[PDB]
Each structure stands twice: as C-alpha cells, then as structure tokens.
Amino acid sequence: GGRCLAFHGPLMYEAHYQGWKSSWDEWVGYDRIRAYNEENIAMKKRLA
Amino acid sequence: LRDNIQGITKPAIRRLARRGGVKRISGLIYEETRGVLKVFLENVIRDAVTYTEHAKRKTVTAMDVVYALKRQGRTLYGF
Amino acid sequence: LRDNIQGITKPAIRRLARRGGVKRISGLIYEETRGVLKVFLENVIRDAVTYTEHAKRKTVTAMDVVYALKRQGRTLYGF
Amino acid sequence: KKPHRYRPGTVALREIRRYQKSTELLIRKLPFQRLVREIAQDFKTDLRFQSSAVMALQEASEAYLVALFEDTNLAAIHAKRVTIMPKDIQLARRIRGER
Amino acid sequence: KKPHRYRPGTVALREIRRYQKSTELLIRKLPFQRLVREIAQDFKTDLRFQSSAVMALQEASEAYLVALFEDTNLAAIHAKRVTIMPKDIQLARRIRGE
DNA sequence: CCCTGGAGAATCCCGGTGCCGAGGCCGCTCAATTGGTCGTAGACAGCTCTAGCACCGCTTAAACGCACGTACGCGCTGTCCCCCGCGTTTTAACCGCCAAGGGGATTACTCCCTAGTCTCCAGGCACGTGTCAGATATATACATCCTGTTCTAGAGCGGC
DNA sequence: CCGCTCTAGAACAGGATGTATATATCTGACACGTGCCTGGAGACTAGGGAGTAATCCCCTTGGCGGTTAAAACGCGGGGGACAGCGCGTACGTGCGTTTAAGCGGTGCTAGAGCTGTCTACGACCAATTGAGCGGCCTCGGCACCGGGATTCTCCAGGG
C-alpha cells in the first residue's frame, strides 16, 4: 500500500519504484519514512 | 458494428512498419494506413462476396477469398 | 548490328519525358532510360520470339507482339 | 542513477530484426475479424465468415501492408528522410497503379 | 540589341503542353527498328519483323516509358525536386516490381 | 526592390485546296438462324452434422496515455556546376521508287494419335497410431549498445 | 618564441537488457502401416486435325539519291541540388494503467455436403437464308499552306 515508503531516499516506492524497470526492486523491512517524498526528491535534485 | 476501423491499433500498425524495415513511424501514418487497408479490404471482401453469392452459399469460405485475391494478381499460398 | 542502343537519342528521351510532364531532365537519365528500354525490349521481343517460334514462323507478327504485351499486364489496343 | 535510455532508433532496429525473422501475425485476430464483418455488412447483411476465411484475409492484408511499407520506406531515403510520410504512401499506390 | 534569352523551364513546360495534346510518335522509326533487330539477333538470328509489328512495339515502349517518366517525375516533387535523377527511375521500377 | 507599359516570338483562330481515308452501295456466301431430339447438368426436396455464431470466466500480454529529450523534418543561404535556350553544321530520317525472295497464307492427302469405352489393379487416399523434432521454461550466457572515465592532441596565454 | 595549463575529441572498458543456446519435458502433428477402392493404364475402335508438299502472291529487306527536320557541339548563363546550419516539435523510449485478445467451455442453429428426383437445356443433326465483309464508287474533314491576330510573356522604365 501507499505511494512512498523507503529506508533510503525514496523514489515513489509503491508497496516498486515507478518509472523504473522491474529488475531493481528490494523488499527488505527497515525504518521507512515519507518526509513529503524526501521534500520533493531533494527539490528536483538541486534543480537538475 | 461501428468504429471497427480503430481495431487496427497503433502498435499493430507500428509492427507492420517494423516488418517492412521502417525505422521511424509518423503520427499521421496510422490514419493513412487504416484508409489504405480499408480500401484494400473493400475490394477483396466485395470480390469474395460476389464469389460467395454466385456459389449459392451464405458463408464466405477461404477458398473464395483465394480466387478473389488471385484475380487481382495477389494469389495467396497456404489458403 | 552494333551500337544500336544509341539510336534512342538524347532529344528523343527528352521528348519522351516532355510527354510525361517532366520539368528538368538530368544528363544521367538518358543512359538509364536507354538501359530500362533495353531491358523492357529484351523481355517483350524474347516473348514474341517464343510466340513466333511456336507458330513455325520466321517473321514476328504484330499479333504475337500483342500477346507478348498482354501476358505481362500491358495489353495494347490498335494492332 | 539513470536507466539505459536507448537512443531513438535502436529499439526500432531490434523490432525490425525480430519481426523480419518471426512469422507471427502482428495484427490481432479479433479486431481484424470484426473489421471484415462491418465491411461485408455493406454488401450482405446475412453473411458469415469461416475461421480460415478470416485467416486468409489477414495474411494477405498483412503482406500487402508490409510490401506497401517497404515501398513507403524506400521513398523516404529517396526523399532524404528516415520517417515515413502519408504522401509517401500516396506516391506508392499511384506508382503501383492503386491510386 | 538584346537576345530574347528564355529562362530554363518555360520552354520545357511549353514542350510539355505541345507534346501532351499531340499524338505523333516521338521516337524515330528506323533507330527504333534497328534497335529491335539487334536485340532480337541475340535471341535468334535471321529474324524478320513486320512494319506493323514494330509499330506495336514502338507505341507500347513509348507509353511504358512515358508512364515510367510520370512516376519518375512524381518522385521528384515527392523528394522536393524538379529535376529527375537516375535513382528516381530505380525507385520507380522497384515500387512497380520490375 | 516591386509594379506596370510595350514589343518579340510561339501559339491560336481562320480562308482556300484537296485527297485519301472514311462513308455508302452490291453481291452473296458462309456463318447466323429454325426445328427436332435426346443425354444430361442442374434446380428442387429432405437429412444431417460439423463448423460458426453468441455469451461467459480470466488472465495477461497487448494497447492508450503522459513525461522527457534528442535524431530528424523542415525553413533558409549560396554556389557552382549541371542543365536548358539558342546559333551552326552535319546527319541520318522519311518519303519517292524498284526489285527480291524468303515467307505468311491457303488447299489438299494422308497418316498418327488423340476422342471414346471395357476391364482391372496397383498406386493413392482416409483412417489409426508410435513417435521424434519443435516449443515452452529457466538459469546461463551472449552481445552489442549506451555511457562514463581517462588518454592525448590542439589552441590559447604568459614569461623570458 | 617556447613552455605550461585548459579544454575537448575519441578510443576503451564496464553495466544493461533483450535476446542466443543447453538441457527437461511435453506434445502434437508426421510419417509409417493398413485397408481399401476409385481413377489411370493396357487394349481396342475409329476418325480427324496437323505434317508435309505444293503454290502464290505479297511484303519486308536491301538499296539507292533528296531534302529539310533534327541530333550534336558549343557558348552563355541561370536557376536549382545539395552541403551546411539553425529551430523545434513531435515522434522514439519508458512504464502506469486499463482493457480487450485469446484460451477454454457450452449451447444452437445457419447452412453446405450428400442423396434422390425429375426436368428443362444445349450440342448435334438436317435445312436453310440473309446481312457481314471484300471490293468498288463517291465525297468531305481535317492535314497542309499560308494569313492574320489576339494574347500572353519578358524586358525596360518608374516610384
């Protein structure tokens, strides 16, 4: 469930990273937070 | 049966272009390909309709379509 | 009989393209058009040769030329 | 990190090699089949089509479109292009005599 | 004193109009006659052709080449050109299947 | 640089000749027309039964849509060399005329082999089935393409 | 004028994802075997259409001069194909999401073979006969020859 849950810097992890291939998924259980999707992926990665 | 000309989907037309060696496919080619396919089908099927009507049959066989394509110089092997 | 492929002169090829509505004619078109005409003549006359050989005749008639053109989907009227 | 991001044309060539060696039909059976029925409805209301009857029409239409696309593609390189255009098909049918 | 000096293209279009509404044979008779005999002598020697037999060959060859030139010209405007090329003819024969 | 008036030349409308191909006429003869007569393909009636039509689960690969950017269609420039318009001089094209002799066309005699049956039998077809090459499946493995990092060459700058 | 540092093109190596293969096993038509059985083959009868011979007249090839239309050569030049550059958009790539294609299943009947049946229909045979075509007479429509002209087009002058 949800749309953003990851232990590292999230990239819209669903339950899987959207916009990425299926051969990258990790299903480990750690301390997961949202932080408004790491404050909008670190303000668009410091604006490109 | 309406709007069945859209049954030839965009990837289906794209796959036909890839079989023909086409590298880049324009966005306006799908309407033109559908129109060409509709015109080609409106000749062969109508030819098969006259073949079916003349044969005292109400179902179109592949055998009648074989002569319908053959009479236009497009003979098909394997039926 | 040698060098008879040059009988189709450059203005003659120029005049043929004028009938087809060609604006400008390149200098390499005449050599290509002569080769295309030679290939086309090598098929029609050879087919007419077999038609003349089948009739036990030594002179090719106009009717055999018509049948040679008709079998390739290029039927000619007036002969 | 970034994905592979294949350049435009690379996957197109892979699709070209795949579909030129595989004989599977590109057009789906049912959407093409219903197109036969609605076209034949204009000529006969009470008409039926065999499974092999629709099969024969599909391969002939696919081969004709592939042959048309081959002539359409060759006109593109002839016109200093790599993208097929609707005017290229109109040129292809007219040269072939199919308007 | 200034010469007329027609620009290229206008007289060519004039030749197009004067030769599309006319029906005279553009290719001369004996040059086409001698070409037929040379080609036929490679297939069979001591072969003769009737006068009307070459007449059928001459009109059919001109109409086939005119129709080929029409597709050749149509390829030029399709390729954003007004001058026909030898590669234009090669494309025309390939599409027709010849 | 664009708009407009005047004149050079290929093209279009028109009067007179005529001539040679098109229109009209005479036989008449051979192919179209009339009647009869059967073998026989075909329209019609009943059975059926095998394949297509219609609807239903489902699941899953196929397809619509949106975000992004880089190969590419397209707009614009020059040039120069490739092609057209025209003057000149050959050149073979066409018609004018004449035979030639292989050769197309026609007629006839005759002779082989193909039309048409009888019988049969041995190769071909429908049915049944063991089976052996292809497809699905998946970890393994290619395999080339895209991209990142480093190597080396080139141009710019500063000092002696 | 030479050495030093900056910058960038390009060869090279590593990661990535869609296919090339090495089995495991299913599997499903493939070809072999069988039993017929239905069409081709040996043999025969008869006749008819072409092979061959002859004729004939006809028509294409070779072979000349004449001439004037046109191919060919060359000069001037002029407008266009293409190399090149710049813009941008619109189509390649990629997954989210949806949605219908297809596999399998069930039921029904639409109707194509299949088998009789009976029936008009067309090839073939006498008998015939009337306008199509080869040929001849006539005649007029447009090719030819000029004559003239509107009439569309390019070059030069002006704003």
Swiss-Prot record, chain A:
Which family is annotated?
A: Belongs to the MRG family.
Q: Which residues of the full protein are shown?
A: 11 to 112 of 401
Q: The organism sits in which domain of life?
A: Eukaryota
Protein task: Component of the NuA4 histone acetyltransferase complex which is involved in transcriptional activation of selected genes principally by acetylation of nucleosomal histone H4 and H2A. The NuA4 complex is also involved in DNA repair.
Q: How the protein assembles, per its UniProt entry?
A: Component of the NuA4 histone acetyltransferase complex composed of at least ACT1, ARP4, YAF9, VID21, SWC4, EAF3, EAF5, EAF6, EAF7, EPL1, ESA1, TRA1 and YNG2.
Full protein name: Chromatin modification-related protein EAF3
Extra remark: Present with 1890 molecules/cell in log phase SD medium.
The cellular location(s) given in this protein's UniProt record come to:
Nucleus
Originating gene = EAF3
UniProtKB/Swiss-Prot annotation, chains B, C:
Site of covalent link Glycyl lysine isopeptide (Lys-Gly) (interchain with G-Cter in UFM1) = 10
Modification N6-acetyllysine occurs at: 10, 38, 58, 70
**For the modification N6-butyryllysine, which residues carry it?**
10, 23, 56, 58, 70
Annotated GO CC locations:
nucleosome; nucleus
Where N6-propionyllysine occurs, the residues are: 10, 23, 56, 58, 70
In the record, N6-succinyllysine modifications are located at: 10, 56, 70
- Family recorded in the similarity comment: Belongs to the histone H4 family.
Please explain the role this protein plays, according to its UniProt record: Core component of nucleosome. Nucleosomes wrap and compact DNA into chromatin, limiting DNA accessibility to the cellular machineries which require DNA as a template. Histones thereby play a central role in transcription regulation, DNA repair, DNA replication and chromosomal stability. DNA accessibility is regulated via a complex set of post-translational modifications of histones, also called histone code, and nucleosome remodeling.
Q: What is this protein called?
A: Histone H4
